């Protein structure tokens, strides 16, 4: 199906502690592949996934060069932000950035992303047309005028349409066996009485990839939306994901409830009934 690549980066200033911490991570779909940590001894871009280590040291030499340059830019951006918002050097501030691309199943470019957040709020973002900027406040509007005059968007479009898409296609083929795999959820139900008259039914989905999944409880076919307790999908740590969903039912009525599991690794949706 469709695929995506994303690079995330965070810069956190620590004024009395020395220079800001910079951490970047890359991802293909839900799989992390690279990382760089400015406080780490290595001072290199490091592999986090099996299929990326086969790259030669010229790849790594170039990638840690570009990520090191990014940490310097976002460091100066943190100081420019202090001026724009007229903030004191006492405080710690955060600059986040995301960029990357989506491709279809034929590998064609669909979408591209280049965007920033300051102290957890949108700062400036490149629009889907990849020619225009969305500035979130008056401070960001200064950056927008500056980048409009310098034609920053055209550079990013070239990267996002060319280099980003080619990288993504390559990783997808080199990592074909892990990245184009689909692991269906392993499912089961637990049942705990909570009183004389009531019991909890919990529906589990384990070991699935990718993370996207839907768990739904029905009673006699009627969706239980408002009465379903649902946990955020969570990593198991081995590269797969977990989720569960629970309802409180009257004792003896368990057989009226069905849990429905939809995942792209299942031939057809699963229905579970206690």
């Amino acid at each position: 199906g469709s695929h995506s690549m994303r690079y995330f980066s965070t810069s956190v200033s620590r004024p009395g502690r020395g220079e800001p911490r910079f951490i970047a991570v890359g991802y293909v779909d839900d799989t992390q592949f690279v990382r760089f940590d400015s406080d780490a001894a290595s001072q290199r871009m490091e592999p986090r996934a099996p299929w990326i280590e086969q790259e030669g040291p010229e790849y790594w030499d170039e990638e840690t060069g570009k990520v090191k340059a990014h940490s310097q830019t976002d460091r100066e951006n943190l100081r420019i932000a202090l001026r724009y918002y007229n903030q004191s050097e006492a405080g710690s501030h955060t600059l986040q950035m995301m960029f990357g691309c989506d491709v279809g199943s034929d590998g064609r470019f669909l979408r591209g992303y280049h965007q920033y957040a300051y102290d957890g709020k949108d700062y400036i973002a490149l629009k889907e047309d990849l020619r225009s900027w969305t500035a979130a406040d008056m401070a960001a509007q200064i950056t927008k005028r500056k980048w409009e005059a310098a034609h920053v968007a055209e550079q990013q479009r070239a990267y996002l349409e060319g280099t980003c898409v080619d990288g993504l296609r390559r990783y997808l083929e080199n990592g074909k066996e892990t990245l184009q795999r689909t692991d269906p959820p392993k499912t089961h139900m637990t049942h705990h009485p909570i009183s004389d008259h009531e019991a909890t039914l919990r529906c589990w989905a384990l070991g699935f990839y990718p993370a996207e999944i839907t768990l739904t409880w029905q009673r006699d076919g009627e969706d239980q939306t408002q009465d379903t307790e649902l946990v955020e999908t969570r990593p198991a740590g081995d590269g797969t994901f977990q989720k569960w969903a629970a309802v409180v039912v009257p004792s003896g009525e368990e057989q009226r409830y069905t849990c429905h599991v939809q995942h792209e690794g299942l031939p057809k949706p699963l229905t579970l009934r206690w």
Partner: peptide, 5 residues
């Protein structure tokens, strides 16, 4: 594959 404010 991996100007200021």
């Amino acid at each position: 594959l991996y100007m200021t404010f």
